[PDB]
Structures are given as structure tokens and as C-alpha cells.
Design a protein around this ligand. Structure first.
Ligand SMILES: CCN(CC)C(=O)c1cccc(C)c1
Ligand SMILES: CCN(CC)C(=O)c1cccc(C)c1
Ligand SMILES: [Cl-]
Ligand SMILES: [Cl-]
Ligand SMILES: [Mg+2]
Ligand SMILES: [Mg+2]
Lengths: 125, 125
């Protein structure tokens, strides 16, 4: 099943809460719309350059990046609730090696790869 | 459970069979001993420089490397039987980013990291 799962247990409320201030920071900086975030989360994969940089910004603000600003998938995994560790692993197992010229391109590459892999459990806020 | 699992079912016999010709090639190329391989597989981590290159050679001969000879973990995962997929996932989840000067160093880094992560299922032939 590919329908996004959105209920009281998933996405983990603690992760949603933790992401709220990072959302404020990154939406402020990039000027992405809330609509574009919601559509990417719950509807079709779509192209929006500010959204790509919004995705990069969340990784940077969450401190899940290396010295070059590239996503460090282990740091990212560590930062997620343990309840979603297995789902996350499977979502990212064919998404190890982002491609793209810029950090925004590579961040978007990751989100798109995850959403293609597990659209039910992929989300973005 | 940290003791190496060695029985008629695991390691998968079909994988051991497929590895045999690669072992012959790579031992010839690198000068590692049969004993050094068995010791690393079943006994303790140890740092034999020819073993490290043997490890690198298997990745090359198995065609699970990128254009620069670095291990491509997705390619590697796809080369393993389904029966090992989950074991390999967990074994590698904190071994994503090898460290080392040479390709032999990085290959050893991976094997050591896998063996530290799951010495029950880690093996080398
Ligand atoms: C270490 C986990 N992993 C390797 C398979 C990942 O790609 C991974 C890490 C964090 C978050 C997501 C969605 C995937
Ligand atoms: C894609 C699987 N993976 C990411 C978690 C790995 O590190 C991985 C891949 C192949 C073989 C082993 C032992 C680990
Ligand atoms: Cl889509
Ligand atoms: Cl798998
Ligand atoms: Mg020795
Ligand atoms: Mg050296």
C-alpha cells in the first residue's frame, strides 16, 4: 500500500514536535510554501527549487550533515525515534549515494528516493 | 549471541560456492594465507596487510565497487542472497562510510566494522 500513513502514532509525534522549530527556521530562510511541503509529503513528488533547499536546510539545522554539508546517513538515523529505525533503514537502503550538483539537489535526491521507496511512511513537515 | 554461526544452512552454501572462484583469484593476487582468512572469519579481528588486500580484491572481482574501486554498498547488498538481506542491513547500518588511505585499508575497515557489529553472522571465505 502506497497511501501516506498519517495518524496519532505515525509520523512519531515527538519527531513532528522536534521538527517544528526547524521548519520555522528553514521555511523563513528559503521562502518555500507550506503548500509545497504538504504536497511533497502527502501527494505527488514535485519539483520546487525552494523546497529542495528547504530539505537541505532541515538536514543542516538538525546537525545530520558532515563537514561539507552532505547528509550523514548514520547521524540522521541516530536522530530519528527508535520506533521508526527499521522503516527508515528500509526506506534508505537503495538511497545511499545522493546525486546532484548542489547540496539542495542532493537533499532533494534523498527525499525523492525515500518517497519512491516507501510512500506510505515517507513524510515531510 | 556473539559466537560465529557455522552450520549446514549458514553461511548460505550457494554463496560459499559462488565465492570459491573469487577466493582462488584473490588469494593468488594478494598472497594472503588460507589460515589468515579463517582466523578473521571465525576467531578474532587481526591486521594482516595481505588479508586487507584480499578483502579489497573480493569486492573488485565480485563487481561491487564504483568507478574508483570503492565499495558500493547497494551493489553489494544486491549480490547477497535474500536470506542474508536483513542480517546485512543491520550489520552495515553503522558501517556506511569506510575510513582509510588505500582501497585495502577501506576494505578492511568495512570487514572489521561488520564483524564488530554482528560477529555471529559475519564470515569471510
Ligand atoms: C543508516 C540508515 N540508512 C542506511 C540504509 C539510511 O539510508 C537512512 C538513515 C536515516 C533515515 C533514512 C530515511 C534512511
Ligand atoms: C544496503 C545495505 N547496507 C546499508 C545499511 C549495508 O551497509 C550493507 C550492504 C551489503 C552488505 C553488508 C554487510 C552491509
Ligand atoms: Cl509521485
Ligand atoms: Cl533488503
Ligand atoms: Mg598475522
Ligand atoms: Mg598502509
Amino acid at each position: 500500500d502506497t497511501t501516506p500513513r498519517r495518524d496519532a502514532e505515525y509520523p512519531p509525534p515527538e519527531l513532528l514536535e522536534a521538527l517544528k522549530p526547524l521548519h520555522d527556521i528553514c521555511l523563513g530562510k528559503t521562502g518555500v510554501t507550506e503548500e509545497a511541503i504538504k504536497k511533497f509529503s502527502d501527494e505527488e513528488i514535485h519539483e520546487d527549487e525552494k523546497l529542495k533547499c528547504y530539505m537541505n536546510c532541515l538536514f543542516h539545522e538538525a546537525k545530520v550533515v558532515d563537514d561539507n554539508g552532505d547528509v550523514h546517513l548514520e547521524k540522521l538515523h541516530d536522530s530519528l525515534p527508535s520506533s521508526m529505525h527499521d522503516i527508515a533503514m528500509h526506506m534508505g537502503k537503495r538511497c545511499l549515494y545522493p546525486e546532484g550538483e548542489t547540496l539542495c539537489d542532493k537533499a532533494f535526491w534523498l527525499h525523492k528516493c525515500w518517497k519512491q521507496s516507501d510512500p506510505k511512511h515517507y513524510f515531510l513537515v
